[PDB]
Amino acid sequence: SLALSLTADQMVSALLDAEPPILYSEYDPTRPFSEASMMGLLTNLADRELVHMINWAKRVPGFVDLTLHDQVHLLECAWLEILMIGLVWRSMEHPGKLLFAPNLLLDRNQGKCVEGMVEIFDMLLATSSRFRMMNLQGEEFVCLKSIILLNSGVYTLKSLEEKDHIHRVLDKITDTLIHLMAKAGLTLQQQHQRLAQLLLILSHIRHMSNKGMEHLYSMKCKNVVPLSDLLLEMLDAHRL
């Protein structure tokens, strides 16, 4: 495996180089939007982001070492966590707002336009606020995103010591986080505290993803918000 041979700096460089781009929405201020069509902007955006995420995942060290079945499973488990942590990252500098796209910046007032989204909105805002107070670094963010990809579906016969390989890569990403923090001049106590602070965020990201998946399944059944074939297949994986 190439993943296990990388140094911490080579790991960060690889992850930084694999970053997907920030996409634009189809939002138009002159166009009236309904709750349905505003949510349409977000599901259309997420669909386009998913294509980039799939090709990003191939560049996460260790991910292509896995079978195709396992790669499918990890992305089916983690895709909304990964979209959401990216959303939170790019919203850091916009307190009280979510930057879905450079042309789509929404506050809580617009989050209440669609019913049932206010809570998820507020949770995303709280997570971004937490990143801002921690002064989360881009190098730490790309580490957290790869951990989500590898970790979120690892616990969902003989052959599969694939789980062992995933665990050794995750250990390497932990080493990489600690190296970043040591270079930031943190004391060892501060390094362990910050590492814990970052990993506990992942629990909240998991929570928000689960709640988002529930509302997404609801939006499908209402059959008013367009959902792409890929989104429907991703959503279907979380139901069976």
């Binding site: 294509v51 799939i54 090709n55 995942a57 191939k58 195709l68 790669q71 499918v72 992305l75 089916e76 074939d229 890929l230 297949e233 991703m234």
Partner: peptide, 9 residues
């Protein structure tokens, strides 16, 4: 299966 095909391409 779309995700399967995109990972294979």
């Amino acid at each position: 299966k779309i995700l399967h095909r995109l990972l294979q391409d």
